[PDB]
Symmetry: none
Subunit: 216 residues, 4 copies
Amino acid sequence: PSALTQPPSASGSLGQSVTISCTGTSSDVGGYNYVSWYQQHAGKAPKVIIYEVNKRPSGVPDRFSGSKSGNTASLTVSGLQAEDEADYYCSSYEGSDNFVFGTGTKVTVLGQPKANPTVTLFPPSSEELQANKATLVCLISDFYPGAVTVAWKADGSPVKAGVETTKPSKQSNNKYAASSYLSLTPEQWKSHRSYSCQVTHEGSTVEKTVAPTECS
Amino acid sequence: PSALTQPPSASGSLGQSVTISCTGTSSDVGGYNYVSWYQQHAGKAPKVIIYEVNKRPSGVPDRFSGSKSGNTASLTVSGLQAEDEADYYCSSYEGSDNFVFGTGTKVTVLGQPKANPTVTLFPPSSEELQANKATLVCLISDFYPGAVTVAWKADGSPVKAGVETTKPSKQSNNKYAASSYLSLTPEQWKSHRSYSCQVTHEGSTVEKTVAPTECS
Amino acid sequence: PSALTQPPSASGSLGQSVTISCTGTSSDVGGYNYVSWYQQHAGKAPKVIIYEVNKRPSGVPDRFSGSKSGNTASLTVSGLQAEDEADYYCSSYEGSDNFVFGTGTKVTVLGQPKANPTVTLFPPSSEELQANKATLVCLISDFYPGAVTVAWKADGSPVKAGVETTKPSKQSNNKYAASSYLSLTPEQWKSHRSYSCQVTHEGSTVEKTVAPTECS
Amino acid sequence: PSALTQPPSASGSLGQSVTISCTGTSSDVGGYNYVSWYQQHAGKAPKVIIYEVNKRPSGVPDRFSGSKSGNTASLTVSGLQAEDEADYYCSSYEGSDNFVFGTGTKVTVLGQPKANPTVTLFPPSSEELQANKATLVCLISDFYPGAVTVAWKADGSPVKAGVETTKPSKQSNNKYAASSYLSLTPEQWKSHRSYSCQVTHEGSTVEKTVAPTECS
């Protein structure tokens, strides 16, 4: 059902082999084998660049690879040309109307040297508490490529709700800045010990942990 | 092969509906009966809402309508749920294990009610300052529509320095959200009465202030 | 011993998979397995880009492939970047001091549309005969890429000797022009029925046949 | 890794000898004992003449000499066989299944005796003309050194048109060879007394003439 788990950002040096993946859950997403790879550009329609794990519709260079082991589907660009910088998607089919997609993946031809993100989690201002409100920020910044996964945990348990996030914005130093938020009641704030904000960028994770207080 | 017609626009209002184009040939669409529509929310994975021209996928609002005759395929969206604003694509089978796509149509709901941003300045932090950095952040949330301009004060003087401000993500409904951030040192910090994040939107200006008297 | 038989010209469209090969003779060149691939540029030293059929010295992209079936060694560029236009060589090792090489192969990033060569075999001028001399020309021209194999046969038997050939020269229309020759005695000329000049260019051969005469 | 020193030049004369550089480090050359030299004739496959510093390959002139001490490796070529003019490269082992190369040295033999080109105009042909094309060709052969300039006459008038002339290949010894060719129609052909291919080389001008009276 719903989601295939698919990377944030993936990127190479133009000429370098870069392989993306999709993961799943056996059911739908296993040796119950289909799964297609789509390309996208700018602000455009999807475009099958693969189907049935590994077969291409026609007009696809060999370089475009498709593989599947266990729960996880691979798609390899075996010679990145600038044209290959684009957003990609894995999708799978589950009986009747269950046309599920992955999360995405953004392949970038590495312009800048590639920075990892400064995660900064903030507690609800004691004043905003005085106003009977609660909001926590994960300021994620200083990165390139500008595609990251964002998450929030309570007591090391996934905050399913209340969560919002920003799309990466260019900065005066050619970096990306995202921001995730969580809005609650002081009561929900008060009932725990640790609220985390965990972001991912290529093979780089950061969890930022924050804890409840009164300040007064 | 080639790919198939759609309109650059499509509108409506709370009720007012909209119907889209997907114009192909008897080689595809006009041939087989596999009209599928992908609801591309502004930088997202697709969420198909309809395949086989007419029968909605497992959880899609009883609202989307496959509407076709020969070489033309139409989506219909009655009762504009507004939370419909998105990129809408089509895909036709054309034999030999192949599909091709409708150009894309961008739905814009009208009669969306306007709101001013909730402003929240976030004070620099303990853990933060122990690393001896001082980062101030303005969460500019829940405003429609997505124009907003941010401005920092160092006391009275209009301060621009490390003041990085992101473009307004689409907010789990057609409310917007942007982030702002001042880069400071603990020193720059406590040498100043306040700091402010003046946010102006649709005439209405809101502005919050922070003082080093906090438990950070 | 001596030669591995290796193509004339090989070339792609930049982004397209291009595979070169080497052929041999079992003895030396068989399941008596080694064989290395070297690159070259401009006027420069060779450069191992592969060894032991398929292993790379370090600083070689995955794209660089190496394979061996039966008598024939493959080397595939799985994503040609302009930098990949260069001359290539296969080489094999035969006991003690037998470090044999292939003929070559030139990989070109296809600038021009790729032309095949106008072969034109000429008989010894009756006058040059009057001068007791014999020379035959294979004017090979109008091609791109400018790397061709040239050969000469007598009675459908390989002219081992007397043979010379020119390196491809650029022309006012950006084409290459080569010229092979054969010098003999009128006696050797007279003793046969058919002198051929057979040239190759990618998967395109032309044999040009000429026959002895007196003219008077 | 990196690659190793050689001189851009190396000379001698019929006797006079030459000795080359291959200067590396104790990581390679100065370490293991695998000094190998590749005799790159101007656009050719390598022909190794020496491996393991000193013992010549299976058929290499009893003339080439591996000459080394520590970090310097020298080839020596006594008794300049002139047919030695070529690009000369080295290669050092550096552990872990790896080799690296000497920059290249270009041997130039002096005291090479000079000769004027044998000129041969080739008359347009029967088979040729039956296809109704008229191609005239000048074989400019066996001249040292490789400067020669070609010139066509249409009767008396100096004619340039389709007169494509190639650069002088190296001729199975250090004699040179170039080709020239006039593009004509059978008509242009027989409307003219003669045609000539004036070839000037080192002061001496040679010029051959062709007339439609031939059995072509």
